[PDB]
Design a protein around this ligand. Structure first.
Ligand SMILES: CCCCCCCCCCCCC(=O)OC[C@H](CO[C@@H]1O[C@@H](CO)[C@H](O)[C@H](O)[C@@H]1O)OC(=O)CCCCCCCCCCCCCCC[C@H](CC)CCCCCCCCCCCCC(=O)O[C@H](COC(=O)CCCCCCCCCCCC)CO[C@@H]1O[C@@H](CO)[C@H](O)[C@H](O)[C@@H]1O
Ligand SMILES: CCCCCCCCCCCCCCCCCC(=O)OC[C@H](CO[C@@H]1O[C@H](CO[C@H]2O[C@H](CO)[C@H](O)[C@H](O)[C@H]2O)[C@H](O)[C@H](O)[C@H]1O)OC(=O)CCCCCCCCCCCCCCCCC
Ligand code: CLA
Ligand code: CLA
Ligand code: CLA
Ligand code: CLA
Ligand SMILES: CCCCCCCCCCCCCCCC(=O)O[C@H](COC(=O)CCCCCCCCCCCC)CO[C@@H]1O[C@@H](CO)[C@H](O)[C@H](O)[C@@H]1O
Ligand code: HEM
Ligand SMILES: CC1=C(/C=C/C(C)=C/C=C/C(C)=C/C=C/C=C(C)/C=C/C=C(C)/C=C/C2=C(C)CCCC2(C)C)C(C)(C)CCC1
Ligand SMILES: CCCCCCCCCCCCO[C@@H]1O[C@H](CO)[C@@H](O[C@H]2O[C@H](CO)[C@@H](O)[C@H](O)[C@H]2O)[C@H](O)[C@H]1O
Ligand SMILES: CCCCCCCCCCCCO[C@@H]1O[C@H](CO)[C@@H](O[C@H]2O[C@H](CO)[C@@H](O)[C@H](O)[C@H]2O)[C@H](O)[C@H]1O
Ligand SMILES: [Fe+2]
Lengths: 37, 65, 33, 54, 108, 484, 35, 62, 339, 31, 30, 49, 37, 33
């Protein structure tokens, strides 16, 4: 019957895509050196 | 039903003869039931190289016993 | 030179999975009407 | 004595890995768990094969 | 049969050693049974995909036009009949789907 | 409202956006050929080119740059190894970096056209809808290509203005780069003679120009134009695949079979050099003549060049190797250290024995000992067997001639069969196993890999040639069948 | 003219003649009818 | 409709999109070469397999 | 209407339909078959393989075929005149040039069938998923009979166009090329079976759902092919399978297109492997286990046991199969078991 | 006088068949 | 390492099955 | 070896045969053996999962 | 100005997600054995 | 047992990248409307 009247779409604008794509790579770029060790 | 009592019999007998006549032998160069190993010398008359075989097949076949 | 043999997978997953997770959310937002 | 390892834990790709069928020593006898003397005896003679296919 | 992907291969080969299964006739039909299955699976798959009453735009996917529960015939027999009926002689084309599909499932 | 495998149809008519694609693709290929060059170069060792060449080194892209005459680098090492250098700007990094910079300038350029798709150039007056002239657009590109062909043939290959093509001796012993005098005549079609290959392009370019001149000047016929569906871009796609599909074989042919286009120094010797026993006939004939000249029979084998002998090996030829066995050939047996010599087996009575050399098929081949009569006067059993013709029973004397150790006789089960099991591979070699951590299991050369990639990709485009070919003709109907 | 060269020439000639003959036949046959 | 420097230059080139040589135009001269090219290409093939030995050519190495 | 009148004649309606391809097909095809039978009956293979399998000596139906020109006869195309045949017919059959006569005339014929399978469409209006589907045997035929031989010392290595011929070609891979384990060939056995399977399961389902248009128990004649609604309810079949196997097809379109797909994709991914095996890139020993096998003889897998089998096949089959190599193996050297 | 429609098919096909049947039968009595 | 990848790959298959059987969107009629 | 081979093959079919008629027998008694009825499909009205 | 009047959204329904997720894993499951080698 | 050292990354990328590419397209479709 009722499909949970409470729902919302998830929104991430273009900017907050960059920061992560930037943040992830940097942390990797920073932590890849140790993972090779 | 006119010439189909003529064509088939006269034609089918041709194939009967080329075996019986053995004409198919030297036409297709198949060995003859006695002809494999000339003399004794039991070995494969295996043709070898190029620009030869026409002449080389004529060695293996040449002996023929 | 010698290295941690599996250390390479570390980077790849640490790069892709967080990356991808940002794309998937984003492409959605692009589809919002 | 030739034991065969078709198990996956021992150095086997999916390709090479398989469940070995029962031995000849066991012949065709119905060979359930309890009939076998020891658990490891029941595995070493190829029990799990005869168990799966039934 | 040792059950496994290498185990199976080991089985056949050894089985081939003793019983010479290839020259056996029953197997030699089984091959025909499998191929002609795969074969017919291609044609009867192809000819009907070939003929599709078009509910779709060229840009849109061709499949989605089919509405689950269409009581229209999604594929022209008249179009596809003559196709295979022209490709080979028109006599063998198996007019009847109910006749076809059975033969489709008898052969394999 | 589009399937995931149709997504690029959106370009169908956007002639601007289209030019953006091809660029981005183009810019993306150069970046490859640029980068791979460095990577291949990064791991390459010039150190020992005499015994250990570039083909055996696993290096793939590199030998092409050499094929056109790019040799040396800034690191101060020539291909041939003498390392006297006047490399000029153009060397492996240079060729490499040039592509990278090329990749960039295209990539940027790609963004431009992608940004501005609409252009007053692409829409003819009579129809506001986009169009471009497929017959006319063709003539230019062709007339431009041939003019680049005739150029490549005249100025570069000839060495007129430029370096010369690679060329070699038939034995692969003489590494050389020279301007190739074009010879066009009956012989010019022997592909083992590059003197045609030059004259080819120079002859192609002219025919390249005249055609390119023609199609620009005139439009194709009505009845034809209607048939081929010219004006529907895909009909250029379908056709264009066939030509490429066609060429993809011919290279595989000239790569897999020998071609003077691809010398034996750069790419490993073709499969058929082994099977014909090309080298061994041509190694012995200089040894025979050397003994026909006369010397210590050791002295004869002593002056024979290793590199020649090194071409004679079973792990050498491309045929022997696995698909999923990966990496440079050196990973198979190790690096080649030095060349032992010619192992001669004597009966223990002195009568010389011949091993039966390994055909390309068998992975494990029975090691046999035969004599001039072809009979087996010694052998090896498999594991447990009753002893007849077992060399430990019937005696063997192995004495290496030439190469590292000479006149050094070994008689015993353990040491002889050590070589006897290696001997069937061809001439023996010392290998450094652990330096590269080799397993002792063979791998295929570049000449192999290059081919398999194209034969496959060819055989695909066949199906690719059909699929579009179906959709050029049927683009009218292809949307769907009409009722009855 | 090698035996090979000459032979190849012969082959091509024969081929052309055949295709020629076949085409001619089809044409004529086609021309014969006139629905 | 953005008309740029090149776009103004080239466009007069390909302006003719509909004008097609009437009738068979020249078909025949094409089919001449094509058939001739086929015979040509065949001769390459006959050579390279050493089916066709020209005097002086050697499919042996150099 | 010179060229014109020719066209409509070819495209007219007759018993069969001879298209533009027909000119290419029937002559090229009828010779292939027309050749094969002849070579089957009369032309021996003796001077080539040293062993006579052909219909005119004692040999049966199954064990006859047209062998291949020998190894040292090389990759030459063996034309009828040729340098080697020199226009002599007999020695052109004995050398097995008839083989190549079959392949080439076959291939073009095989092509000419494909083109026909187009030329039908444009004048009918069907979409050409038929021809495209037929490209799979093409790839298989071309890869097996053409690309594979060229990756070998000569034509000698190739199927001999016979029932038993193809078998000595089968084991020929298993011994040397270790074919079963080649993963590109596992995609094939998926395709064929996956074709055969779904072939049978479609034909069964639609045969088990019928709207009962006729009276008599047997429903075949019960079908009237006039503008009818679907002769079998998709509704039932759907809810049917969804409750047994769990997953069904809701699209007659998506179903059939999936039939066309699997057999085709089944062969191509096989036709890739064969090409990969023309170069002797054959899938073979896993470096993992082999090195491990060098660390003890006792370790055994159903892989390792195959290597002995593939080893025995080679040694035993070699002398007969490849007489040209002049192999003589001693007795003990054969890798016999119990050792 | 048969122009090509149908006659050309069988009579270029089944005729050799009758000619091989000679080879089949006349063989079985050899040896 | 070696084995643990296979079980993982083979796991997600099962996690697809159970997931693809029950959670499919029912193809309603009309 | 003949009998065991022979009777097996036959015995195999009769399994199929049994599994054949048992289908047609019950469906006949069930009345819809004559094919699904186009007027009212039994599946047509059911709870849709 | 005009942002390319020709565009279409890409659509992949739930099913064609499974097949791929199934196909990919299987090919991996089949080809992972060789990649380890 | 001994193995190709890098062969593991092969699977991961061959699993994830084709997989992911199907998800991203799918999640989009879910967002349509
Ligand atoms: C660097 C790399 C870069 C690569 C980039 C690209 C990567 C590749 C991407 C490729 C994937 C994308 C894709 O697959 O798309 C599908 C494609 C396009 O389809 C289109 O999709 C839409 C457009 O986006 C539109 O709808 C459009 O019209 C069109 O449909 O399809 C194709 O073009 C053809 C390509 C097919 C590829 C092969 C697919 C088949 C092979 C699958 C894998 C086979 C593995 C073999 C070994 C297997 C195993 C052992 C572990 C698996 C065991 C189970 C095997 C048996 C099940 C396999 C499938 C059987 C048939 C069912 C398929 C089906 O359609 O059913 C679906 C849902 O079913 C499933 O997904 C199966 C999931 C598992 C079920 C298991 C059952 C468990 C039983 C347990 C025992 C019980 C006792 C629903 O049915 C259909 O759904 C839709 C389809 O259109 C529609 O509703 C239909 O009518 C129907 O309902
Ligand atoms: C799909 C479409 C439908 C299919 C339609 C198919 C019809 C056309 C069939 C093509 C077959 C033609 C045969 C070509 C051939 O044998 O042509 C000959 C060459 C192959 O040549 C081989 O080349 C070998 C290489 O030897 C070399 O090395 C030897 C060493 O002693 C000698 O020196 C010899 O002279 C020298 O050439 C030998 O010459 C062999 O005798 C010869 O078989 O193929 C080449 O030209 C052809 C190159 C393309 C072949 C692609 C194979 C790549 C895998
Ligand atoms: C250079 C040659 C060439 C070019 C320009 C095209 C171009 C095109 N093809 Mg196409 N095709 C080709 C070769 C080519 N194809 C070949 C060889 C085949 C046979 C395999 C096909 C089979 C084919 C089909 C069956 C269809 C097309 C379609 C299309 C159109 C849309 C493509 C699309 O949406 O796919 C997008 C595809 C993806 C986004 C997935 C790509 C993932 C693949 C599987 C792996 C790629 C990874 C990487 C790039 C590998 C490198 C490739 C290697 C060769 C270097 C587009 C015009 C479609 C079309 O026209 O209908 C509208 C269509 O239905 N093609
Ligand atoms: C024409 C293309 C081509 C060719 C001939 C080669 C050839 C070669 N490369 Mg190479 N390479 C290429 C493209 C190519 N590469 C590209 C595009 C890249 C960028 C990714 C690289 C990156 C690269 C690196 C990083 C290295 C090489 C190396 C090498 C050499 C060793 C062989 C090897 O590593 O391959 C291995 C080959 C295989 C494992 C073959 C299996 C690959 C499978 C079959 C393809 C996937 C099929 C697919 C899953 C089918 C799915 C079916 C589905 C669609 C239904 C060899 C000479 C190595 C080297 O330095 O030389 C010694 C090396 O380290 N290459
Ligand atoms: C079975 C394979 C096959 C199939 C189905 C097709 C199908 C198609 N091709 Mg084609 N093509 C093929 C192979 C094939 N081609 C090959 C191998 C080449 C060489 C690269 C080409 C080159 C080609 C071009 C250049 C063009 C097509 C085009 C087309 C399309 C329409 C016209 C046509 O059918 O021409 C196909 C015609 C033939 C295949 C000719 C028949 C075969 C000849 C007569 C054999 C004669 C060989 C000769 C006697 C010498 C052989 C000696 C031996 C030693 C080899 C159609 C989809 C046209 C197109 O784009 O359509 C829009 C087009 O412009 N194709
Ligand atoms: C018309 C269709 C057709 C086609 C495309 C071919 C194609 C071919 N035939 Mg051929 N042939 C045909 C009809 C055809 N045949 C007919 C009707 C006969 C009469 C029985 C023959 C009798 C025949 C013989 C006796 C031989 C061939 C051969 C060949 C091949 C060499 C081609 C060549 O030298 O000529 C090229 C011509 C042009 C390009 C023009 C080639 C594959 C030769 C062969 O075996 O190939 C190796 C060969 O020895 N053919
Ligand atoms: C973001 C998108 C990314 C998509 C990536 C998806 C990757 C999926 C495939 C992964 C393959 C991994 C192979 C592992 C072995 C390895 O590692 O080969 C390596 C090079 O491989 C390679 O050069 C792979 C490329 C091969 C080029 C030829 C392609 C032929 C196409 C086949 C026909 C078309 C179907 C080099 O080998 C390694 O490095 C060598 C030393 O440098 C040693 O051999 C090591 O032991 C080790 O083998
Ligand atoms: C040298 C051999 C043969 C000759 C000269 C010959 C003669 C002819 C001729 C001239 C015709 C056309 C005129 C007519 O139908 O009365 C014909 C028709 C026919 N004959 Fe023959 N015949 C021969 C062999 C055969 C064979 C072997 C068969 C085997 C079935 C056969 C069966 C037929 C058939 C089926 C037709 C009908 C042709 C059609 O319907 O287009 N004939 N015959
Ligand atoms: C911009 C710019 C720049 C830069 C540049 C660069 C930096 C670039 C790079 C680029 C590059 C460096 C690129 C590369 C890439 C490559 C690629 C992208 C590749 C890929 C490929 C593929 C994908 C493949 C596939 C495959 C595989 C993977 C496996 C198997 C096989 C095959 C082939 C299928 C500069 C500074 C100059 C300046 C100006 C501007
Ligand atoms: C529904 C499916 C249920 C599946 C149930 C089982 C789930 C368990 C998953 C984890 C099991 C993996 O099993 C684990 O594999 C790794 C692979 O690196 C093996 O580890 C491997 O490398 C280590 C490292 O030195 C060796 O010591 C070991 O002998 C070797 O086999 C482990 O010995 C084994 O314990
Ligand atoms: C796709 C999802 C990825 C899930 C991956 C899970 C990986 C879990 C890793 C657990 C630890 C295994 O980590 C890895 O162990 C293996 C053996 O097991 C060790 O491997 C070592 O011994 C093995 C013996 O088989 C040799 O083949 C190998 O060359 C050598 O390095 C590695 O040095 C270590 O890197
Ligand atoms: Fe179907």
């Amino acid at each position: 019957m009722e499909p949970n009247p409470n729902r919302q779409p998830v929104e991430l604008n273009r900017t907050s895509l960059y920061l992560g794509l930037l943040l992830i790579l940097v942390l990797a770029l920073l932590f890849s050196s140790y993972f090779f060790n | 039903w006119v010439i189909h009592s003529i064509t088939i019999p006269a034609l089918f007998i041709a194939g009967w003869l080329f075996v019986s006549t053995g004409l198919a032998y030297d036409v297709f160069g198949t060995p003859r039931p006695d002809s494999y190993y000339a003399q004794e010398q039991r070995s494969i008359p295996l043709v070898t190289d190029r620009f030869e075989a026409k002449q080389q097949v004529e060695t293996f076949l040449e002996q023929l016993k | 030179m010698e290295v941690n043999q599996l250390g390479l997978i570390a980077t790849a997953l640490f790069v892709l999975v967080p990356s991808v997770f940002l794309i998937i959310l984003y492409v959605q937002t692009e589809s919002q009407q | 004595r030739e034991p065969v390892s078709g198990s996956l834990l021992y150095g086997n790709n999916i390709i090479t890995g398989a469940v070995v069928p029962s031995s000849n020593a066991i012949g065709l006898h119905f060979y359930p768990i309890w009939e076998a003397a020891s658990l490891d005896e029941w595995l070493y003679n190829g029990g799990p094969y005869q168990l799966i296919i039934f | 049969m040792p059950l496994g992907i290498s185990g199976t291969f080991n089985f056949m080969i050894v089985f081939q050693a003793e019983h010479n299964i290839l020259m056996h006739p029953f197997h030699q039909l089984g091959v025909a049974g499998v191929f002609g299955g795969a074969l017919f699976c291609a044609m009867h798959g192809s000819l009907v995909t070939s003929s599709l009453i078009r509910e779709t735009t060229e840009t849109e996917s061709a499949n989605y036009g089919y509405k689950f529960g269409q009581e229209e015939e999604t594929y022209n027999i008249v179009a596809a009949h003559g196709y295979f009926g022209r490709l080979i002689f028109q006599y063998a084309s198996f007019n009847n789907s109910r006749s076809l599909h059975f033969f489709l499932a008898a052969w394999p | 409202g589009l399937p995931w495998y149709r997504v690029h149809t959106v370009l169908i008519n956007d002639p601007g956006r289209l030019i953006a694609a091809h660029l981005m693709h183009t810019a993306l290929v150069a970046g490859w050929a640029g980068s791979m060059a460095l990577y291949e170069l990064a791991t390459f060792d010039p150190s020992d080119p005499v015994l250990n060449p570039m083909w055996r080194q696993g290096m793939f892209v590199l030998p092409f740059m050499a094929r056109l005459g790019v040799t040396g680098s800034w690191s101060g090492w020539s291909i041939t190894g003498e390392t006297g250098i006047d490399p000029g700007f153009w060397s492996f990094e240079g060729v490499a970096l040039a592509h990278i910079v090329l990749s960039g300038l295209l990539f940027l350029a790609a963004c431009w056209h992608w940004v501005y798709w609409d252009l007053e150039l692409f829409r003819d007056p009579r129809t506001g809808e986009p169009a471009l002239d497929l017959p006319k657009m063709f003539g230019i590109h062709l007339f431009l290509a041939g003019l680049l062909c005739f150029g490549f043939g005249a100025f570069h290959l000839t060495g007129l203005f430029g370096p010369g093509m690679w060329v070699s001796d038939p034995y692969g012993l003489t590494g050389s780069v020279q301007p190739v005098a074009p010879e066009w005549g009956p012989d010019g079609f022997n592909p083992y003679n590059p003197g045609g290959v030059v004259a080819h392009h120079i002859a192609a370019g002219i025919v390249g120009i005249i055609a390119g001149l023609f199609h620009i000047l005139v439009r194709p016929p009505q009845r034809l134009y209607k048939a081929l569906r010219m004006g529907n871009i895909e009909t250029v796609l379908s056709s264009s695949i066939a030509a490429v599909f066609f060429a993809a074989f011919v290279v595989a042919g000239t790569m897999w079979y020998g071609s003077a286009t691809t010398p034996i120094e750069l790419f490993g010797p073709t499969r058929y050099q082994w099977d014909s026993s090309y080298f061994q006939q041509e190694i012995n004939r200089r040894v025979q003549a050397s003994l026909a000249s006369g010397a210590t029979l050791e002295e004869a084998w002593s002056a024979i060049p290793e590199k020649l002998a090194f071409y004679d090996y079973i792990g050498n030829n491309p045929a022997k190797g696995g698909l999923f066995r990966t990496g440079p050939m050196n990973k198979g047996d190790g690096i080649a250290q030095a060349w032992k010599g010619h192992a001669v087996f004597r009966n223990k009575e002195g009568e010389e024995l011949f091993v039966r050399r390994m055909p390309a098929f068998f992975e494990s081949f029975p090691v046999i000992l035969t004599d001039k009569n072809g009979v087996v006067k010694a052998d090896i059993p498999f594991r447990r067997a009753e002893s007849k013709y077992s060399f430990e029973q019937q005696g063997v004397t192995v004495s290496f001639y030439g190469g590292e150790l000479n006149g050094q006789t070994f008689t015993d089960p353990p040491t002889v069969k050590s070589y006897a099991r290696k001997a069937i591979f061809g001439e023996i070699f010392e290998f450094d196993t652990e330096t590269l951590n080799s397993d002792g299991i063979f791998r295929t050369s570049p000449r192999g890999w290059f081919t398999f990639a194209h034969a496959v990709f060819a055989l695909l485009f066949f199906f690719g040639h059909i699929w579009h070919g179906a959709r050029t003709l049927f683009r009218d109907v292809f949307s769907g069948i009409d009722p009855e | 003219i090698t035996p090979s060269l000459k032979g190849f020439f012969i082959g091509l000639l024969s081929g052309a003649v055949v295709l020629g003959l076949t085409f001619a036949v089809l044409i004529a046959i086609s021309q014969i009818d006139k629905v | 409709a953005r008309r740029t420097w090149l776009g103004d230059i080239l466009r007069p080139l390909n302006s003719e999109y509909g004008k097609v040589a009437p009738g068979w135009g020249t078909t025949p001269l094409m089919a001449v070469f094509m058939g001739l090219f086929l015979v040509f290409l065949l001769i390459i093939l006959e050579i390279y397999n050493s089916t066709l030995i020209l005097d002086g050519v050697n499919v042996s190495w150099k | 209407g010179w060229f014109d009148i020719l066209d409509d004649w070819l495209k007219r309606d007759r018993f069969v339909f001879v298209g533009w391809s027909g000119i290419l097909l029937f002559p090229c095809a009828y010779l292939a078959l027309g050749g094969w039978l002849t070579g089957t009956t009369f032309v021996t293979s003796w001077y080539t393989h040293g062993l006579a399998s052909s219909y005119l000596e004692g040999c049966n139906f199954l064990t006859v075929a047209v062998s291949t020109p020998a190894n040292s006869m090389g990759h030459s195309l063996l034309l009828l005149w040729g340098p080697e045949a020199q226009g002599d017919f007999t020695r052109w059959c004995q050398l097995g040039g008839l083989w190549t006569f079959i392949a080439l005339h076959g291939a073009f014929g095989l092509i000419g069938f494909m083109l026909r399978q187009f030329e039908i469409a444009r004048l009918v209006g069907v979409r050409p998923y038929n021809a495209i589907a037929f490209s799979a045997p093409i790839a298989v035929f071309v890869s097996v009979f053409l690309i594979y031989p060229l990756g070998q010392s000569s034509w000698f290595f190739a199927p001999s166009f016979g029932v038993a011929a193809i078998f000595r070609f089968l084991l020929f891979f298993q011994g040397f090329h270790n074919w079963t384990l080649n993963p590109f060939h596992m995609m094939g056995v998926a395709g064929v079976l996956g074709g055969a399977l779904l072939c049978a399961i479609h034909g069964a389902t639609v045969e088990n759902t019928l709207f009962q248009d006729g009276e008599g128990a047997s429903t075949f004649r019960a079908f009237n092919p006039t503008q009818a609604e679907e002769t079998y309810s998709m509704v039932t079949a759907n809810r049917f399978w969804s409750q047994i196997f769990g997953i069904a097809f809701s699209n007659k379109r998506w179903l059939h297109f999936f039939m066309l797909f699997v057999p085709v994709t089944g062969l191509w991914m096989s036709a890739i492997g064969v090409v990969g095996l023309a170069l002797n890139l054959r899938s073979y020993d896993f470096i993992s286990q082999e090195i491990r096998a060098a660390e003890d003889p006792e370790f055994e897998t159903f892989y390792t046991k195959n290597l002995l089998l593939n080893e025995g096949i080679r040694a035993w089959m070699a002398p007969q199969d490849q007489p040209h190599e002049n192999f003589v193996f001693p007795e003990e050297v054969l890798p016999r078991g119990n050792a | 006088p048969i122009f090509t429609v149908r006659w050309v098919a069988v009579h270029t096909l089944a005729v050799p068949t009758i000619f091989f049947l000679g080879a089949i039968a006349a063989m079985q009595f050899i040896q | 390492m070696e084995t643990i990848t296979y079980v993982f790959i083979f796991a997600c298959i099962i996690a697809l099955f159970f997931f693809a059987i029950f959670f499919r969107e029912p193809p309603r009629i009309t | 070896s003949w009998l065991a081979t022979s009777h097996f093959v036959l015995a195999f079919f009769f399994l199929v045969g049994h599994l054949w008629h048992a289908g047609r027998a019950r469906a006949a008694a069930a009345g819809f053996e004559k094919g699904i009825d186009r007027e009212s499909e039994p599946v047509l009205s059911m709870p849709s999962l």
